[PDB]
Write an enzyme that holds these catalytic residues in place. Structure first.
Site, short mmCIF file in Angstrom:
data_model
loop_
_atom_site.label_atom_id
_atom_site.label_comp_id
_atom_site.label_asym_id
_atom_site.label_seq_id
_atom_site.Cartn_x
_atom_site.Cartn_y
_atom_site.Cartn_z
N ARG A 24 -55.78 -52.60 59.56
CA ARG A 24 -54.72 -52.95 60.49
C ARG A 24 -55.29 -53.38 61.84
O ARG A 24 -56.27 -52.80 62.33
CB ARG A 24 -53.75 -51.78 60.69
CG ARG A 24 -52.91 -51.49 59.46
CD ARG A 24 -51.87 -50.41 59.72
NE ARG A 24 -50.86 -50.37 58.66
CZ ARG A 24 -49.83 -49.53 58.64
NH1 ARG A 24 -49.66 -48.64 59.61
NH2 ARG A 24 -48.96 -49.57 57.64
N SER A 127 -37.71 -33.80 46.38
CA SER A 127 -38.03 -34.75 47.44
C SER A 127 -37.78 -36.18 46.98
O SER A 127 -38.24 -36.57 45.90
CB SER A 127 -39.50 -34.58 47.85
OG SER A 127 -39.91 -35.57 48.77
N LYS A 146 -43.04 -28.62 43.71
CA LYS A 146 -42.20 -29.71 44.17
C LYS A 146 -41.87 -30.65 43.02
O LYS A 146 -42.61 -30.73 42.03
CB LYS A 146 -42.89 -30.51 45.29
CG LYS A 146 -44.14 -31.25 44.83
CD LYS A 146 -44.54 -32.34 45.80
CE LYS A 146 -45.68 -33.17 45.25
NZ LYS A 146 -46.09 -34.25 46.17
N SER A 179 -36.09 -46.71 56.30
CA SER A 179 -36.21 -47.85 57.19
C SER A 179 -36.75 -49.10 56.50
O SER A 179 -36.38 -50.22 56.89
CB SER A 179 -37.10 -47.51 58.39
OG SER A 179 -38.42 -47.18 57.99
N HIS A 207 -33.63 -42.52 61.60
CA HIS A 207 -33.17 -43.90 61.72
C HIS A 207 -31.65 -44.01 61.77
O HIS A 207 -31.12 -45.13 61.77
CB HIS A 207 -33.70 -44.75 60.56
CG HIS A 207 -35.17 -44.97 60.62
ND1 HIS A 207 -35.75 -45.89 61.47
CD2 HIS A 207 -36.19 -44.39 59.95
CE1 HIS A 207 -37.06 -45.86 61.33
NE2 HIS A 207 -37.35 -44.97 60.40
N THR A 257 -35.61 -37.82 65.91
CA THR A 257 -36.64 -38.16 66.88
C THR A 257 -36.00 -38.57 68.20
O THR A 257 -34.87 -39.04 68.24
CB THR A 257 -37.51 -39.32 66.39
OG1 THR A 257 -38.60 -39.53 67.29
CG2 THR A 257 -36.70 -40.60 66.31
N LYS A 260 -37.17 -43.15 68.89
CA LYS A 260 -36.58 -44.35 68.33
C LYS A 260 -35.40 -44.76 69.25
O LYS A 260 -35.62 -45.35 70.34
CB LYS A 260 -36.19 -44.03 66.88
CG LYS A 260 -37.15 -44.60 65.80
CD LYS A 260 -38.52 -43.88 65.67
CE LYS A 260 -38.74 -43.30 64.26
NZ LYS A 260 -40.09 -43.60 63.75
N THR A 290 -47.30 -25.92 73.82
CA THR A 290 -47.64 -27.29 74.17
C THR A 290 -46.47 -28.18 73.77
O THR A 290 -46.19 -28.35 72.57
CB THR A 290 -48.90 -27.71 73.42
OG1 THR A 290 -50.01 -26.91 73.84
CG2 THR A 290 -49.23 -29.18 73.66
N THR A 375 -47.29 -49.63 52.39
CA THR A 375 -45.96 -49.34 52.93
C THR A 375 -44.87 -49.76 51.96
O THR A 375 -43.84 -49.09 51.85
CB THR A 375 -45.80 -50.03 54.28
OG1 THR A 375 -46.95 -49.76 55.10
CG2 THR A 375 -44.54 -49.52 54.98
#
EC number: 2.3.1.37
Lengths: 460, 448
Positions: A24, A127, A146, A179, A207, A257, A260, A290, A375
């Site tokens: 990348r 999942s 899982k 997304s 999202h 989040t 975004k 933190t 991706t």
């Protein structure tokens, strides 16, 4: 003797990423608060229009956010009350008893999932195959058994749940809006499956939040849209179907989040008071000690307060997205169908997608990042475009013509062409049923006065 | 079905700040605030993306370049926080080398412990700062087995310091990588605040300034800071910001940049936050008076506590742990200090420290002037009388604990010598003042 060759290992691994073209190169993009959605490259004079940014409501530059940072900096400095205010707003947004803030939602996912797995060793996690990397990592760190179910396949999910006694603890981890393709989960049906098989639900709205529901609390709120709109900040007495509890109330854990739509950085989980104190007590203490600066939290708080009482942000984004989608449909530009805010343009070849992304920024001054493997699956490569309230029809027209020219210049497949080989991902597929946009024409016509007056500057 | 609420229920059932994380008091410094105000106006609040999508920008490039320049490393990579940085690097080391053997100091903080767990490789915990046992653990393997020695420069609870040069000597001999956590060092040590690794060759770095020196303090080829393979730090303490980073070779940086999900899949930190850290790093690099100020304030307090018999655990660093010995008394002393004396010091108890070692942790900064120290000193002396807490002589009668009142105990000499404490900003090389720091290619990816 000779030691292990560390540089050799590093070289061989990075070389593989160069061979398969997944290595990348980051683009220098400086987004202009005063010129949104413009940005400049390393030279300030070279300006581009950003169509791929994840700041969905353009709140990163909004006056109430910028004023919140400036005033909070003067008082608090750079690096308490600001945490409680932010956590209280997030709990209000999702109508949950509490919320817990982390450095990022990546951390929030990893921390919550890890803790659920450590505290219940018998836990079984179910999942969605498209879940975010953070959730995959958290599930791994949970160190429990899982099962990955095919994307949004509720049939396969149920039979996986059936194979267990109801007394076995279970977690269903999924996202509201994925997304890359813009698909949406059916949250009520997953809640129904959770109630039947005795499972907790873990929902990543990252999202969704800010973009869906009357107040932007996400798709879980959109599920009962009228019940939430009428009740405003308050919990409704009944859901849209007449029942006792809303979908957003039925989801056990909602993560989001601040990075975004809320034009900031951060992450959080919203859930019942018992769950919040549980995470707060038994998660690694260092993720609490933190945390984000107060100026950053004040900004996110202002963005949440503003977006909750302005639905025009959501109706504006939706209208601009539909504008772009309709135009591309008339031109045969292959958009992957989806009832969401995302405008993925199907390419189908990794090399061509890169060239299309390069031509768009160099020739047309349009910034759209290309999406390829890992991706997405090879052959599905696409350009991801994300309209906001700031992309007005004038800017959209430029984007539309520019994309159309790139398709002509590279002779890229149109909707017409994908059909000839049978279609892909709903593009050019005979008899393919597309889902209607989550925002109905009735909801898109609403204005800010239609929201309950208790959402505007309530004490929190 | 399964009872979740039962399990959860079962498990659940104006002041002066002396414990703060901001060691140089730079969080409110004008040059940091001015950089943020200006960056906010230009960039807005958030980055609006990740490093791969929309979230790569000039403030990121300048921050990573400044960090690499501070540690004189080929490159640096910024993460959401320090604990993300440790977890990212350590996880990837154990993921890509599954046979790697990790040798960890017993006092490493949870973030490093978590990262080593996530590495999912064989590990050996060696007694704190015991290099004889470490060498014994390293010798039991052939040199060819990949190894990582993971430790910190300054351990924050007792303020002890690792010997970095000797560990590097052991790493060269037995073929191991070194992972050094400077979180509690950067800004406080070395002429320029690059941490203890820079302090190891203090005069070579002070002479060369921004540049790599041609020899170390002993005349050898490579400085200690150069020999450390991975140096992690925070932007959240001395640099008065939020964030985390690693400084290493550009190949390692590109490795983390490419393979680390905790780097890739999270939002980039706000540009103003990065500009703020960059301003702090640049200011602190060329102001050594911040470090001499903090050391003198820490030494001032220690001396006063000594003359009053206040039992400070001896350490050669900036930390002033005050030994209490009982958890309830330590909390009660903290409560009295804040309510009665308006002094905020947090009591440190188990698990963080062993039971019976409970203490009050005090962290002086350049902003704590002797007048504030005097108020702290008098308040602690009063609280010790109100609660009848043991004094140095009392610990001495019981044989001593952790070097307090211990017969024939020689204290480690301060990292900052009298000669070094006398230096001023004029004794630094001019090239550290207003330097032009070029951006790094590895931050954007390397072309071949």
């Amino acid at each position: 003797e000779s030691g292990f060759d560390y540089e050799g290992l590093i070289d061989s691994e990075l070389q593989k990423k160069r061979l398969d073209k997944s290595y990348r190169y980051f683009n220098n993009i400086n987004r202009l608060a005063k010129e949104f959605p413009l940005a400049h490259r390393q030279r300030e004079a070279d300006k581009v229009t950003v169509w791929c940014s994840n700041d969905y409501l353009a709140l990163s530059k909004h006056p109430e956010v910028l004023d919140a940072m400036h005033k909070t900096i003067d008082k608090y400095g750079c690096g308490n009350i600001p945490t409680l205010n932010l956590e209280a707003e997030l709990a209000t947004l999702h109508k949950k008893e509490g919320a817990l803030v982390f450095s990022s939602c990546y951390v929030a996912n990893d921390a919550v999932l890890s803790l659920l797995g450590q505290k219940m060793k018998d836990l079984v996690i179910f999942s969605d195959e498209l879940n975010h990397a953070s959730m995959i990592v958290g599930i791994k760190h949970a160190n429990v058994k899982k099962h990955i179910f095919k994307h949004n396949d509720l049939n396969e999910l149920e039979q996986l749940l059936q194979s267990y006694p109801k007394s076995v603890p279970k977690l269903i981890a999924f996202e509201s809006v994925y997304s890359m393709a813009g698909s949406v989960a059916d949250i009520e049906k997953i809640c129904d499956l959770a109630d039947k098989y005795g499972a907790l639900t873990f929902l990543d709205e990252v999202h969704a939040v800010g973009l869906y529901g009357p107040h932007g609390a996400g798709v879980a709120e959109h599920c009962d849209f009228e019940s939430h709109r009428a009740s405003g900040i308050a919990t409704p007495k009944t859901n849209d179907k007449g029942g006792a509890k809303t979908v957003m109330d039925r989801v056990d854990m909602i993560t989001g989040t601040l990075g975004k739509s809320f034009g900031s950085v951060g992450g959080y989980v919203a859930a019942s008071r018992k769950l919040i104190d549980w995470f707060r007590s038994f998660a690694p203490g260092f993720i609490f000690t933190t945390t984000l600066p107060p100026s950053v939290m004040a900004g996110a708080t202002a963005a949440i307060r503003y977006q909750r009482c302005h639905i025009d942000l959501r109706t504006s984004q939706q209208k601009h997205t539909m504008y772009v989608k309709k135009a591309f449909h008339e031109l045969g530009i292959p958009v992957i169908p989806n009832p969401s805010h995302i405008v993925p343009v199907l390419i189908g070849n990794a090399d061509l997608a890169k060239q299309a992304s390069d031509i768009l920024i160099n020739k047309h001054q349009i910034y759209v990042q290309a999406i390829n493997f890992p991706t997405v699956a090879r052959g599905t490569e696409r350009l991801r475009i994300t309209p906001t309230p700031g992309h007005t029809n004038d800017l959209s027209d430029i984007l539309i013509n520019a994309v159309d020219d790139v398709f002509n210049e590279l002779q890229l497949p149109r909707v017409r062409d994908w059909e000839s080989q049978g279609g892909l991902l709903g593009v050019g597929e005979s008899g393919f049923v597309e889902e209607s946009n989550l925002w109905t024409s009735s909801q898109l016509s609403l204005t800010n006065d239609d929201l309950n007056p208790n959402v505007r500057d309530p004490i929190v």
